[PDB]
Amino acid sequence: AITTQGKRIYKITVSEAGAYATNKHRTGYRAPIRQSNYTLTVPYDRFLPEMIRLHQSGAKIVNVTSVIS
Amino acid sequence: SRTVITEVIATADSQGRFLNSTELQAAFGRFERAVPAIEAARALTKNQDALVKGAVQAVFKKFPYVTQPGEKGYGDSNQAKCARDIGYYLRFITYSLVASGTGPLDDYVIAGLREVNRAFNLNPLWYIEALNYIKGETGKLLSGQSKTEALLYIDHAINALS
Amino acid sequence: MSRTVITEVIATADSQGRFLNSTELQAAFGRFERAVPAIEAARALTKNQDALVKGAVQAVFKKFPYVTQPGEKGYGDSNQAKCARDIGYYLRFITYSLVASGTGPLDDYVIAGLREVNRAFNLNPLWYIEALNYIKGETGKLLSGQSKTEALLYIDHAINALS
Amino acid sequence: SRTVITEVIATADSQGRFLNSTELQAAFGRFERAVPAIEAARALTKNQDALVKGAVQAVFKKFPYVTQPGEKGYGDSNQAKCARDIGYYLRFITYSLVASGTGPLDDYVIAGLREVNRAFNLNPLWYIEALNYIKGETGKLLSGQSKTEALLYIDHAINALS
Amino acid sequence: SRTVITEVIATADSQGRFLNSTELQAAFGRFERAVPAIEAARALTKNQDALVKGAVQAVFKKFPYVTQPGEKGYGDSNQAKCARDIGYYLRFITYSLVASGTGPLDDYVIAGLREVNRAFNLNPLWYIEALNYIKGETGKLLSGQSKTEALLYIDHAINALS
Amino acid sequence: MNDVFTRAIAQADLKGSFLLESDLDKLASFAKEGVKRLDAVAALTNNAPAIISDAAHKLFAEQQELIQPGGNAYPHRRMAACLRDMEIILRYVSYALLAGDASVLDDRCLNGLRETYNALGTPTQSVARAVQLMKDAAMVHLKSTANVTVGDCSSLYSEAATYFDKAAASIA
Amino acid sequence: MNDVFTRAIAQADLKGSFLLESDLDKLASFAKEGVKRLDAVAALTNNAPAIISDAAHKLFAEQQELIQPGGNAYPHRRMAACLRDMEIILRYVSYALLAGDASVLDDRCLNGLRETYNALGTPTQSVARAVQLMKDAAMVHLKSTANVTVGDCSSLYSEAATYFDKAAASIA
Amino acid sequence: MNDVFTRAIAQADLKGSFLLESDLDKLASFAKEGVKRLDAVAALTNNAPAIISDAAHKLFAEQQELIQPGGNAYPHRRMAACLRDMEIILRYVSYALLAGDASVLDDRCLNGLRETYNALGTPTQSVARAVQLMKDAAMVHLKSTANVTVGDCSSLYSEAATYFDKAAASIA
Amino acid sequence: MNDVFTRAIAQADLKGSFLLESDLDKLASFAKEGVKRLDAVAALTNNAPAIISDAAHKLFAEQQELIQPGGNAYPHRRMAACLRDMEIILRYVSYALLAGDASVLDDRCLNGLRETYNALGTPTQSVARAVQLMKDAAMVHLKSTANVTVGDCSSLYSEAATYFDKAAASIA
Amino acid sequence: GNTYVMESERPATAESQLRDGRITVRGFIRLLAKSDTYKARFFNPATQTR
Amino acid sequence: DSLARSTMD
Ligand SMILES: CCC1=C(C)/C(=C/C2=NC(=C\c3[nH]c(/C=C4/NC(=O)[C@H](C)[C@H]4CC)c(C)c3CCC(=O)O)/C(CCC(=O)O)=C2C)NC1=O
Ligand SMILES: CCC1=C(C)/C(=C/C2=NC(=C\c3[nH]c(/C=C4/NC(=O)[C@H](C)[C@H]4CC)c(C)c3CCC(=O)O)/C(CCC(=O)O)=C2C)NC1=O
Ligand SMILES: CCC1=C(C)/C(=C/C2=NC(=C\c3[nH]c(/C=C4\NC(=O)[C@H](C)[C@H]4CC)c(C)c3CCC(=O)O)/C(CCC(=O)O)=C2C)NC1=O
Ligand SMILES: CCC1=C(C)/C(=C/C2=NC(=C\c3[nH]c(/C=C4\NC(=O)[C@H](C)[C@H]4CC)c(C)c3CCC(=O)O)/C(CCC(=O)O)=C2C)NC1=O
Ligand SMILES: CCC1=C(C)/C(=C/C2=NC(=C\c3[nH]c(/C=C4\NC(=O)[C@H](C)[C@H]4CC)c(C)c3CCC(=O)O)/C(CCC(=O)O)=C2C)NC1=O
Ligand SMILES: CCC1=C(C)/C(=C/C2=NC(=C\c3[nH]c(/C=C4\NC(=O)[C@H](C)[C@H]4CC)c(C)c3CCC(=O)O)/C(CCC(=O)O)=C2C)NC1=O
Ligand SMILES: CCC1=C(C)/C(=C/C2=NC(=C\c3[nH]c(/C=C4\NC(=O)[C@H](C)[C@H]4CC)c(C)c3CCC(=O)O)/C(CCC(=O)O)=C2C)NC1=O
Ligand SMILES: CCC1=C(C)/C(=C/C2=NC(=C\c3[nH]c(/C=C4\NC(=O)[C@H](C)[C@H]4CC)c(C)c3CCC(=O)O)/C(CCC(=O)O)=C2C)NC1=O
Ligand SMILES: CCC1=C(C)/C(=C/C2=NC(=C\c3[nH]c(/C=C4\NC(=O)[C@H](C)[C@H]4CC)c(C)c3CCC(=O)O)/C(CCC(=O)O)=C2C)NC1=O
Ligand SMILES: CCC1=C(C)/C(=C/C2=NC(=C\c3[nH]c(/C=C4\NC(=O)[C@H](C)[C@H]4CC)c(C)c3CCC(=O)O)/C(CCC(=O)O)=C2C)NC1=O
Ligand SMILES: CCC1=C(C)/C(=C/C2=NC(=C\c3[nH]c(/C=C4\NC(=O)[C@H](C)[C@H]4CC)c(C)c3CCC(=O)O)/C(CCC(=O)O)=C2C)NC1=O
Ligand SMILES: CCC1=C(C)/C(=C/C2=NC(=C\c3[nH]c(/C=C4\NC(=O)[C@H](C)[C@H]4CC)c(C)c3CCC(=O)O)/C(CCC(=O)O)=C2C)NC1=O
Ligand SMILES: CCC1=C(C)/C(=C/C2=NC(=C\c3[nH]c(/C=C4\NC(=O)[C@H](C)[C@H]4CC)c(C)c3CCC(=O)O)/C(CCC(=O)O)=C2C)NC1=O
């Protein structure tokens, strides 16, 4: 985090894809329904768990942008 | 789409290590299962219309009280596309036989079941007795192991409807 | 708290709040049917343990000649007894994982926390890697049919863990 | 590369407040500790090539089996890699001395060491002995605060290696 | 409380790692800055009564109306409480100088002071004026390092008040 | 996230009919060939350390500019990420190979990795050629017939090559 | 998230040569001016609340509209956010002054603030006026040599001026 | 959590009076020798891998009941937990040495470790023996004076030995 | 997420001057008319499941293709999603009715619903036709003055009509 | 755990960013746990199992 | 104490 390699936070735009919604229905609505598209800001170190978890959830990454560098 | 290899892939990709012996052996067992299940599906598709119609008259017989004018299916069109729905469920049973897993059932029919039944005032017990007639006939048609997976899949479907 | 196919199935079913569907039954059937070659391999390895351990000792000696001279870690009669004991326990746990139809025994017994043991005892894995290499070389004739590959899978996983 | 200033300001940003006695005191003490570490970095810069060659021969000396043919360490391009790698290590040690913190070494090499080392089958003992030579030569190079800074940073790199 | 050595111990606990040269440098600088801080503690301790009385009368000078009957300042018990509070503050400032940090002061006055302020209508500006007078008074009681560090401690306290 | 069998099932659904006789024959044959591809992917998992070691050694031998100061593989963490990308990408390729459907490969990070590397500034052509190294090393390792009986593997090799080509195209 | 020594080390690493004795001399010159620079930072810090209050009072003085209906600060919450945003901006400028670098100030505070004010519609001109008043009051309190040894701080004043100017430019 | 300075301030608050000039002089003397204590704890930390290696080797040479099956440290995971247990014991002893007070060691390792090991079935006397062996290795490593100015550190040696004594008495 | 009162107070603060008597009079008149609209909303809530059932029956009547394989409502859970969407859109109509403002509908759902159903590719004209179905059935049950006093709900009927029309216009 | 947090201890910046909504409540909980007061109340006076 | 009893059976 504090490290120069820990910095360079990147923003992520996330779309709750159709496959994501189909998986969500079978798993169950334990979270409130929000509009499929939403934005998010993620540091470098926890950048990985974000798209990993989106991959098990079935969603796909719209794009990636860098806050720093 | 939860065929056994599908959750194999999901479990592998969830954490960092590759496939180890357990799921390789599970896939071996699946490929072993795939043949007798495929003759099961073939023989079942050989007997589509007779089965669906016979189950339809069975549904009438077991519930006579509904069959009165005022029946949800009363009238030729309603019972006809009732038989259509039964054929649809048989379709998805065949699909699960191909997948050797509840993928098709869970994905398509079971999802949203009770909500739709409340929405359209449909008693699942009709469907249940239809699949009971399915048990009755498939006790003869399919034999051996293929019979066993077919019976178990229909049992899972019934428990979903139950 | 071992992880075997049936125990993994039970844990998954308990986690999901549901009973056992078709896939669990098929996996149990596969494990039950594969147990027979695994038991065959376990008995065959049980018969010839002394030859395996002795050959492993001499193979480790011949591969790296720089060891058994005095003044280093491996030299010593107590060191030799520890070599024999370690190889024996390795093959013990390999047989255990063969019988369990899962790597859980090996993982929990040795692979859990092995690396800090090595770095706290200067034990580079390479000696035991060569030991298991000789072990698979010997078992290349010991078993037959399915038992051969059943042993191969778990021993290869153990080697990869050692890597 | 991390500086005591950097960690102080990162903590202040996390707590979202201004700087009190402790942060200013740490900043000061790092500024007075800056110049002896600078001098130590210069004194290690002057002997860079001699240190590199001495470390190479120390590696070839301590463990007999690194020199023979068929060994990973053996190789003309391999020896060039040895010299270049030792130069990397000690240059980033100088960087850490410059920043007056271990952070430069930490991120620049120490992060991701072990898995890369077994990725290509790299012996940590080799780099440990190279840095032992670094200790031996830098002990006679420096005296005083610069000596303490250099020895502590190289030994921190060793502890990361160990 | 939060002393430099205490927070170093805590953070070393956090990452599950031993201490390194940077935090030992921080402790070093703490040890050397202790001596001027120790002399500051001596000068403040020997002057405590005059400090308190001067601060109380300076607050009275700035806001004599508070002493008028029907207000908080009026009442010998009220004035005694003013003096006792200022004495507590001065003692905690001495503890801050001794501890080389705001730890004891923060924990023992700054934690939960504004609650009492609002409840008991105790205007912070009064203690701010008292601490400003203590600043002016220690400007002559202390000089050099001790004056500067005591000043920064007390103005930290003032900024916390406001 | 659909298997090849699930792919055929979805196709039959969209035609709104049952699966064809020829479809049944092809899928039963694929099930018969399932053991061979299981052995192939088991070797892939077992040969994975050898594959990654050989591929990385070849890459660094023929690309030293990755290792020069400031290089894309210089900081010892950028190259560490390169190694983990190697193992995870060959992991996805093995996933696709055993699956029999490239759709899961495309959906798993193939939709995001291209713009990820565009943002990071890494040249994707190096990634693609490292994927070619994956292909070479993995094919060489799988060619070994030790301790296993001999049989046809040409179709599996062709399928794996197509999967590697798809991965390279998606990356770059 | 870096300081000037980190900057120099980053270039030294990416070239991969050693930090020159000339570079060491320059950063040592910064270091021996570091003691004075920390006094400048403490002058920013301890005097921050009064500086902010005076600057905000002036903002209300020249810009009467912002408290009046239709002003960007007319709701109480909005001028409250004005106060806290100026406080955090001065805090980050002090961070820049103590670190002796622009990276520390520009990485977090000055990275998404312009987009926030653009999307929300905040008049960046008023924020720039607030920042320059922050700079003016900061100079007024930094020239105060009360209870501290007198000396020349021209480098510190110039560097803090650069930090305030660059912060205003990033906001604008 | 509390060190000597914190403990003294705590007593001062308990009596409600300022710190005594005598105790202020005691703290001044403690701070004067603080460089020696820092050297001692540095010697601890560099030799900590060596201290733990020596202690583990000698303990396993004298006790063999654990290396065999059924021993409390028989499996790799169990004995690895054992090793990190001694590691953390030494770490907390070092922390107490930094603090000069045993409050932090009590807060971390000596509030409830005993019943923890009783539930785990761990024999405490083995832990105490390991503490003694680490203490011997540590006094050996700190009584050396490598690369540091020589001086009378018998007070520090006594303090470290006594800290190990309290730790051992706590566990067993 | 506004209402009539919120928007009125908003514009009143926008002009800066106090509320004007005429606006207060309109608000009071609405308040007097309030209970009628309240009972209308309650009746809508009571009849909602029947509304959905009948409207779905109609939706199948004029469009059969969705039931047929491949329809976006052909799968069981997809048509279940269709039903709950009918639910939520008519619920938002009820929200608009009880509030009397349009932004509480617009901002809360419509903005994101646009891209939602554009990405889903569902023909929005059929969605608006279904909305018209709910409009008809809801007016059938609402015009029903069963078990309640008879009164003039014509303005409320117009408001409900406008709410259905604007919802359909937004979605289509 | 029903420990009363002094009003001075709380982080204003984190709650302000949550108020704007750029950070989820999960992120705010992360920032809370990472705050030193969490360790001082919980991690510092208590054993690691506890 | 409660966690201890779950380790064995
Ligand atoms: C859970 C079952 C189990 C395993 C797996 C096991 C391995 C093992 N071997 C050990 C020591 C040892 N092991 C060896 C064997 C070495 N001699 C060399 O030729 C080779 C590199 C290698 C064997 C071929 C030696 C020499 C030691 C002594 C290390 C020392 O004390 O310095 C130790 C440390 C315990 C002690 O010092 O008494 C372990 C844990 N022990 C077990 O109870
Ligand atoms: C912060 C204070 C503190 C520390 C450091 C601590 C260490 C600690 N040791 C544990 C178990 C253990 N502790 C040991 C150590 C034993 N091995 C040998 O045989 C000796 C008899 C003895 C060491 C000399 C072992 C082997 C276990 C594992 C128990 C088991 O799996 O059977 C556990 C619980 C389970 C686990 O972490 O795996 C902890 C938390 N406990 C605390 O409350
Ligand atoms: C995706 C899997 C699937 C299911 C679960 C399914 C059942 C189903 N039943 C429906 C209504 C109906 N369902 C039935 C049949 C029931 N009432 C009779 O009494 C029978 C005895 C009994 C059957 C056991 C009838 C008569 C209707 C007509 C009501 C209407 O048109 O709204 C509908 C509404 C649209 C339509 O099919 O015309 C569906 C989708 N169809 C499917 O494609
Ligand atoms: C700047 C960060 C950095 C580090 C830390 C580093 C170490 C390092 N050396 C490597 C190759 C190598 N390194 C060596 C040298 C080692 N064997 C012995 O001779 C020596 C004692 C020792 C070096 C001092 C050798 C022989 C190779 C050949 C590849 C192999 O077989 O592993 C590799 C793999 C790819 C490469 O760089 O060529 C790394 C990561 N390289 C870096 O770019
Ligand atoms: C953390 C404890 C600590 C503090 C607080 C600190 C500040 C500090 N700065 C000093 C010298 C100085 N301080 C300054 C800066 C000040 N003079 C200028 O007139 C400006 C108005 C102002 C800058 C805002 C200057 C110019 C010097 C003399 C230059 C030199 O360092 O030789 C001195 C020595 C004189 C004395 O004993 O008071 C101290 C203590 N140093 C510390 O170790
Ligand atoms: C779902 C699976 C997944 C993938 C595939 C993935 C790619 C990926 N690689 C990254 C960094 C990186 N990846 C590489 C590797 C590339 N550059 C080298 O030259 C090689 C030729 C090449 C190997 C393919 C490098 C060098 C970086 C560092 C970039 C930086 O420091 O900014 C990052 C940024 C965060 C990080 O991992 O450090 C991502 C997201 N992330 C994922 O979660
Ligand atoms: C759980 C994972 C798994 C294992 C452990 C496994 C072993 C295995 N594979 C088999 C089929 C086979 N295995 C191979 C081995 C291939 N021949 C080529 O040379 C390749 C180098 C090599 C790997 C691709 C062959 C040729 C067959 C027979 C092909 C067939 O009949 O389908 C058989 C039956 C052969 C017999 O009993 O006579 C076994 C026991 N199979 C699996 O799916
Ligand atoms: C819609 C939200 C809103 C509110 C609530 C509001 C009231 C308000 N009046 C203010 C100025 C002021 N308000 C007062 C009045 C107070 N001082 C005394 O005279 C009186 C006893 C007392 C009145 C009861 C004064 C004198 C100022 C000038 C402060 C200054 O000297 O700058 C300020 C602070 C700005 C400043 O410092 O000049 C606010 C927030 N304005 C708004 O836009
Ligand atoms: C990433 C680090 C960080 C930054 C950069 C930050 C500043 C920041 N400024 C914001 C907008 C704002 N900025 C201002 C201040 C302006 N408007 C008027 O008051 C003045 C003319 C002028 C100041 C001179 C206001 C009032 C808002 C919110 C507008 C509103 O809510 O209507 C916002 C979004 C809404 C909010 O304040 O909650 C943030 C987060 N906070 C952070 O945690
Ligand atoms: C980064 C942390 C740090 C270290 C490591 C450090 C070492 C260090 N130890 C010192 C003195 C000393 N250091 C020691 C301690 C050592 N001598 C004894 O023989 C023991 C074997 C051993 C401790 C167990 C002693 C006894 C002195 C002499 C006291 C004095 O010079 O005032 C000095 C002062 C040199 C001088 O005054 O000329 C330094 C810089 N300084 C630091 O800021
Ligand atoms: C947050 C507020 C909210 C909105 C804005 C909303 C609309 C909405 N409908 C959705 C899916 C859907 N919407 C429909 C309905 C359409 N397709 C046909 O049946 C009809 C012609 C037509 C309806 C009249 C269908 C079938 C899906 C499922 C698509 C799929 O599963 O692939 C989704 C995707 C997420 C999910 O299904 O849970 C949303 C967000 N629902 C909400 O809770
Ligand atoms: C438990 C919650 C609750 C409800 C829902 C409720 C309904 C309700 N609405 C009322 C006003 C009324 N509300 C209506 C509206 C109705 N007549 C027609 O127009 C429509 C079919 C329908 C509304 C859409 C009418 C006509 C009145 C009588 C107003 C009058 O006196 O002229 C009254 C008082 C009747 C009176 O004093 O004259 C009641 C009790 N009361 C409650 O305590
Ligand atoms: C569910 C409702 C509720 C109850 C029942 C409650 C009791 C309560 N009192 C507490 C501390 C305290 N409670 C008191 C109050 C008592 N001690 C004094 O002697 C007085 C005689 C007396 C008040 C008149 C004090 C002084 C403390 C401080 C002790 C401490 O936290 O260190 C705490 C610890 C909270 C924290 O600081 O994190 C709780 C939970 N708190 C609640 O939110």
Residue numbers in the entry:
A (entry chain m): 10 to 78
B (entry chain a), D (entry chain c), E (entry chain d): 2 to 163
C (entry chain b): 1 to 163
F (entry chain h), G (entry chain i), H (entry chain k), I (entry chain g): 1 to 172
J (entry chain 5): 592 to 641
K (entry chain 5): 740 to 748
Authors' own words:
Phycobilisomes (PBS) are antenna megacomplexes that transfer energy to photosystems II and I in thylakoids. Here we show the cryo-EM structure at a global resolution of 2.9 Å of the 5.9-MDa PBS from Anthocerotibacter panamensis (hereafter A. panamensis), a recently discovered Gloeobacterial species that diverged from Gloeobacter spp. around 1.4 billion years ago. The A. panamensis PBS features a configuration comprising two herein characterized linkers and presents a paddle-shaped morphology. The two-fold symmetric PBS contains twelve APC hexamers assembled as a heptacylindrical core surrounded by twelve PC hexamers, with approximate dimensions of 273 Å (width), 500 Å (height), and 129 Å (thickness).
In addition, a chain-core linker CpcN (LHC) was found connecting five PC hexamers into the top two PC chains. In contrast to the tightly stacked rod cylinders in hemidiscoidal PBS assembled by CpcC, PC hexamers linked by CpcN form loosely staggered disks attaching on the side like a chain. Phylogenetically, CpcN is distantly related to CpcC but is close to CpcJ. However, the CpcN in A. panamensis has five pfam00427 domains but no CpcD-like domain. The attachment of CpcD to each pfam00427 domain of CpcN likely inhibits the formation of rod cylinders because CpcD acts as a rod-capping linker that terminates rod elongation in hemidiscoidal PBS. Although negative-staining EM and two-dimensional (2D) averages from cryo-EM indicated that the four distal PC hexamers in the top two chains (Rt4/Rt4’ and Rt5/Rt5’) exist, these four PC hexamers are too dynamic to reveal a defined density map for reliable atomic model building. Therefore, the Rt4/Rt4’ and Rt5/Rt5’ were omitted in the reconstructed PBS structure. In contrast, the staggered-packed PC chains only exhibit a preferable inner-chain EET pathway with a longer bilin distance from Rt2’ to Rt1’ (37.0 Å), compared to 24.3 Å in a rod. In contrast, the two pairs of transition dipole moments exhibit relatively parallel orientations in the PC rod, as indicated by the value of κ2 being close to 1. This finding suggests that the efficiency of EET between donor and acceptor bilins in the PC chain is lower compared to PC rods, even when accounting for both the distances and orientations between them.
